[PDB]
């Protein structure tokens, strides 16, 4: 278990921007789907304010059965962090 402040409980575009860098490691359902399906996304839409919107539209387009995995993976991706990246702090 890590320390600090209870993981910010609030889904917002402010976070997506972050997960966008993790790509396939995106801890989000939508921010992840695009990262994979649309690898060159950034290219198509350089301006975040414009790209983020593309992540939503594309996400909604997909069917629940399609997000099924992209929905769980995002959650599991959050765990990998805590586990992996083994670090020792005094």
Swiss-Prot record:
It is found in: Nucleus. Highly expressed in testis and ovary, followed by brain and liver. Also expressed in placenta, peripherical blood, fetal thymus, heart, lung and kidney. Within brain, expression was highest in hippocampus, caudate nucleus, and substantia nigra. Not detected in skeletal muscle and fetal liver. Signal peptide: none annotated. The SET domain interacts with histone H3 but not H2A, H2B and H4, and may have a H3 lysine specific methylation activity. Component of the MLL3 complex (also named ASCOM complex), at least composed of catalytic subunit KMT2C/MLL3, ASH2L, RBBP5, WDR5, NCOA6, DPY30, KDM6A, PAXIP1/PTIP, PAGR1 and alpha- and beta-tubulin. Forms a core complex with the evolutionary conserved subcomplex WRAD composed of WDR5, RBBP5, ASH2L/ASH2 and DPY30 subunits; WRAD differentially stimulates the methyltransferase activity. Interacts (via WIN motif) with WDR5. It is linked to Kleefstra syndrome 2: A form of Kleefstra syndrome, an autosomal dominant disease characterized by variable intellectual disability, psychomotor developmental delay, seizures, behavioral abnormalities, and facial dysmorphisms. Found in a critical region of chromosome 7, which is commonly deleted in malignant myeloid disorders. Partial duplication of the KMT2C gene are found in the juxtacentromeric region of chromosomes 1, 2, 13 and 21. Juxtacentromeric reshuffling of the KMT2C gene has generated the BAGE genes. Belongs to the class V-like SAM-binding methyltransferase superfamily. Histone-lysine methyltransferase family. TRX/MLL subfamily. Histone methyltransferase that catalyzes methyl group transfer from S-adenosyl-L-methionine to the epsilon-amino group of 'Lys-4' of histone H3 (H3K4). Part of chromatin remodeling machinery predominantly forms H3K4me1 methylation marks at active chromatin sites where transcription and DNA repair take place. Likely plays a redundant role with KMT2D in enriching H3K4me1 mark on primed and active enhancer elements. This is Histone-lysine N-methyltransferase 2C. The chain holds residues 1631 to 1713 of 4911 of the full protein.
